[PDB]
Amino acid sequence: HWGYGKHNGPEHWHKDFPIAKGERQSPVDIDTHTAKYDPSLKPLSVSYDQATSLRILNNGHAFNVEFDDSQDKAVLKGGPLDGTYRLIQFHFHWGSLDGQGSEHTVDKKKYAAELHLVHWNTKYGDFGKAVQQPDGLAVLGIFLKVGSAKPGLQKVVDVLDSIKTKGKSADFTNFDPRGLLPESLDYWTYPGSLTTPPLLECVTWIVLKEPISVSSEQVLKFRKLNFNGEGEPEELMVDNWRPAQPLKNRQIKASFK
Ligand SMILES: [N]S(=O)(=O)[C][C][C][C]C1234B567B89%10B%11%12%13B85%14B%1158B%12%11%15B%139%12B%1061B%12%112C5%153B%14874
Ligand SMILES: [Zn+2]
């Protein structure tokens, strides 16, 4: 099955998922000089005050912090978006070393990690219908650099010991994702895809310019997770990122001057 190794990693994915070589694949390099300021873009509206987390899951690729998305609580709107997008989960991509791990790059710079807050367009009723539509998802991407600790991340870090291996989950209630946001909501945006199989071309990407800082100790704990299941040989969960894909016929827009 697909993964991140030499034998099943991103360069192989096109065999089972031919859209891997499509016209609107993610991630991409953000060339900051070429991205055009778009004064028609709106400030992003991130409303996470009533977000209700439920559970954290090691799915064998990453860990997912899952939300109750049965009501309209935690929503993303504005920015480049038409309508209302409901938060379903977040997860990260990270490296084996601090010099790699992000999926998007900025002028070819790789960050140590990247957080993805995934939201589905409520006009399609459920996520499974949304991912079949070109405007079905909005993913808010936030870069992580290593420096000062992020206090709002520590509750996630501390639960990781309990979901070390693939298929383990733990109750994970009352986590507030506001504590993972940087100060500024300045962003770049472009049309793209899921960055994991099935690689569906259903995402409006919104990538924040300002990274968050996390400590070396925090990212080291990400790197103790395992891709393997319990009672299998240990494969550290590191380098679970897809490299930048061709931009093709797309424009990256900036919300800021
Ligand atoms: N790296 S990425 O965010 O581009 C795709 C990884 C999350 C994929 C999804 B999980 B939830 B729903 B489940 B189904 B819908 B929503 B998030 B997306 C899909 B699965
Ligand atoms: Zn992701």
From Swiss-Prot:
Gene3D superfamilies: Alpha carbonic anhydrase. Changing residue 141 to R: In OPTB3; complete loss of activity. The gene is CA2. GO terms for molecular function: arylesterase activity; carbonate dehydratase activity; cyanamide hydratase activity; zinc ion binding. This is Carbonic anhydrase 2. Its main location: cytoplasm. Transmembrane segments: none annotated. Zinc. Can also use cobalt(II) with lower efficiency, but not copper(II), nickel(II) and manganese(II). The lineage of its organism: Eukaryota, Metazoa, Chordata, Craniata, Vertebrata.
